[PDB]
């Protein structure tokens, strides 16, 4: 019941899985992208927002620089679920240009 991504609890290990999951894969699935939501959404309850802003901005530069535009939407999809559960906790959100 902890914020882990594909079995990765450490931030360095998380960002590493995303970087590759965004490079080795151009056509992500709803299930795969969902795994990211449960991870970020957990940071809110675990109070690990510190890594949140790090993972968000990290995956952003990737989903943005990615050749597939579909990645741009994936980012919003995760935020639509995370930013929601995060607001109900603190009320604030992340600043994404």
């Amino acid at each position: 019941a902890a914020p882990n991504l594909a079995g990765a609890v450490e931030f360095s290990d998380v960002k590493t899985l995303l970087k590759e999951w965004i490079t080795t894969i151009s056509d992500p699935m709803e299930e795969d992208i969902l795994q990211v939501v449960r991870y970020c959404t957990d940071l809110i309850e675990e109070k690990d927002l510190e890594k949140l802003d790090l993972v968000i901005k990290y995956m952003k530069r990737l989903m943005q620089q990615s050749v597939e535009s579909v990645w741009n939407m994936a980012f919003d999809f995760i935020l639509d679920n995370v930013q929601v559960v995060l607001q109900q906790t603190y009320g604030s959100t992340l600043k994404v240009t």
Partner: peptide, 14 residues
């Protein structure tokens, strides 16, 4: 099916 599933199972498996 999901990349995170086949990847997470890879480390867990041996």
């Amino acid at each position: 099916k999901s990349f995170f599933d086949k990847k997470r199972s890879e480390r867990i498996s041996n």
